């Protein structure tokens, strides 16, 4: 599997997450992808529900796991 682990996938950018943010609903996106996407739809997420970039936090644990993935990845 050269493929990116699914938990590190952003539903919007559809690749690797650079910085995980998590919604109150518990959904995980890449920060910059979500920000920009939410501007395009006008605070609606990819299933058309209301969402603001102000109501997300960085997902610290997962950010950390991503850094480790990145170590193993960029090794090859
Ligand atoms: Cl996790």
Curated annotation (Swiss-Prot):
U-box 1 is critical to the ubiquitin ligase activity, and U-box 2 mediates interaction with host target. The 25 C-terminal region may carry the signal responsible for translocation into the host cell. It comes from Legionella pneumophila (strain Paris). Ubiquitinated in the presence of host E1 ubiquitin-activating enzyme, E2 ubiquitin-conjugating enzyme and ubiquitin. The chain holds residues 123 to 198 of 240 of the full protein. This is E3 ubiquitin-protein ligase LubX. Effector proteins function to alter host cell physiology and promote bacterial survival in host tissues. This protein is an E3 ubiquitin ligase that interferes with host's ubiquitination pathway. It is found in: Secreted; Host cell. The gene is lubX. Residues 3-76 form the U-box domain.
